Ligand binder design. Structure first.
Ligand code: HEM
Ligand SMILES: [N+]
Ligand SMILES: [N+]
Ligand SMILES: [N+]
Ligand SMILES: [N+]
Ligand SMILES: [N+]
Length: 153
């Protein structure tokens, strides 16, 4: 569940994201929606948005971008001991929002793309390797909770 050395690479990278949570959140959701159109359909609140331009202009979308990264920052900071925060999130995405585990992987990919575009020099292969493992650990712990509830798939 990651070495201390890899957790460090991740939070160093995340300290950086914190500088503009709003910009990064807006970019991550627009990229998830562009590459995987089906995920956009899961948000009643953003369906209306067709083009990239419209997505960018939506303040509400940017607001949501902040919610998501604030919650993910709370998880990552726990350095694996994130059960209290992951629980309510796993439960609401399974039973309320109805988000397949496959969409969590798609967003994990989105996150990586944005952190590489932005912070080119701070996100070397080594930081990307540690970041990948953190997201996968989050994804495994969610899927465990999904199964218990009868929504793994
Ligand atoms: C990095 C992973 C994600 C995190 C940390 C995250 C976080 C959150 C949080 C904190 C909320 C607010 C309330 C609640 O869930 O009880 C929320 C709402 C929601 N999430 Fe996520 N989310 C993630 C990924 C996803 C994905 C990938 C989708 C869609 C494919 C999605 C679908 C939704 C929807 C539809 C809502 C409700 C929006 C509303 O109508 O208020 N989530 N998310
Ligand atoms: N490893
Ligand atoms: N916003
Ligand atoms: N964990
Ligand atoms: N929500
Ligand atoms: N790096």
């Amino acid at each position: 569940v990651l070495s201390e050395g890899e957790w460090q690479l991740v939070l160093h990278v995340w300290a950086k994201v914190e500088a503009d949570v709003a910009g990064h959140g807006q970019d991550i959701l627009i990229r998830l929606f562009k590459s995987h159109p089906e995920t956009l359909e899961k948000f009643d609140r953003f369906k209306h948005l067709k083009t990239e331009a419209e997505m960018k202009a939506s303040e509400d979308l940017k607001k949501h971008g902040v919610t998501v990264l604030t919650a993910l920052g709370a998880i990552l900071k726990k350095k694996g001991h994130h059960e209290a925060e992951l629980k309510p999130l796993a439960q609401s995405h399974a039973t309320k929002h109805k988000i397949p585990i496959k969409y969590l992987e798609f967003i994990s990919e989105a996150i990586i793309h944005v952190l590489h575009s932005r912070h080119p020099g701070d996100f070397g292969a080594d930081a990307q390797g540690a970041m990948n493992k953190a997201l996968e650990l989050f994804r495994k712990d969610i899927a465990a909770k999904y199964k218990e509830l009868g929504y793994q798939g």
